């Protein structure tokens, strides 16, 4: 039961590349439910890909690294 | 794609030339590529294609284990 629980707890705790994948499949379900075009849907997918790739630049990522170290990074 | 049962019956019927039939299990690339062209298909949930991939790994590891279990009796 401990082995099954550890395997299930590392599969349930997914990575960010599948949180982005199911963030961007119901988005495709919306863009194909309401029949969007072929240019602005590229803008939507490009914007969510760009904000996912730029999500690893936050100051809140290092909101506990002390001052005069965050100041050196800045 | 070499004929490994004409080579077997030509080379004095040696047992260790019939172990080269197991090279033909590299043709499961075409099935694992099918489950990679299906995981990026947004019509089916990716956590369901992972379950179908595990259920195609569960069987064919009981087919191969049945064949090896009979071979170890022969």
Curated annotation (Swiss-Prot), chain A:
Disulfide bonds: none annotated. Expressed in guard cell-containing tissues, in root epidermal cells and in root hairs. Detected in vascular cells of the root and shoot. Induction: Up-regulated under drought, salt stress and cold conditions. Induced by abscisic acid (ABA) treatment in roots and shoots but not in guard cells. It is found in: Membrane. Belongs to the potassium channel family. Plant (TC 1.A.1.4) subfamily. Major selective outward-rectifying potassium channel of the guard cell membrane. Involved in regulation of stomatal movements according to the water status. Assuming opened or closed conformations in response to the voltage difference across the membrane, the channel is activated by depolarization. Conductance of the channel is modulated in a potassium-dependent fashion. May interact with the cytoskeleton or with regulatory proteins. The potassium channel is probably composed of a homo- or heterotetrameric complex of pore-forming subunits. The segment S4 is probably the voltage-sensor and is characterized by a series of positively charged amino acids. The pore-forming region H5 is enclosed by the transmembrane segments S5 and S6 in the Shaker-type (1P/6TM) and contains the GYGD signature motif which seems to be involved in potassium selectivity. This is Potassium channel GORK. The chain holds residues 300 to 373 of 820 of the full protein.
């Amino acid at each position: 039961a401990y082995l099954i629980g550890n395997i299930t707890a590392l599969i349930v705790k997914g990575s960010n590349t599948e949180r982005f994948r199911d963030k961007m499949n119901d988005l495709i379900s919306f863009m194909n439910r309401k029949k969007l075009g072929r240019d602005l849907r590229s803008q939507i997918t490009g914007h969510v890909r760009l904000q996912y790739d730029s999500h690893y630049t936050d100051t809140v990522m290092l909101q506990d690294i002390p001052a005069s170290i965050r100041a050196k990074i800045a | 794609c070499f004929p490994w049962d004409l080579i077997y019956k030509a080379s004095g019927k040696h047992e260790l030339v019939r172990y080269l039939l197991w090279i033909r299990l590299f043709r499961v690339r075409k099935v694992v590529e099918f489950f990679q062209r299906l995981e990026k298909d947004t019509r089916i949930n990716y956590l369901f294609t992972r379950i179908l991939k595990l259920l195609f790994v569960e069987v064919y590891c009981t087919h191969t284990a049945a064949c090896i279990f009979y071979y170890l009796a022969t």
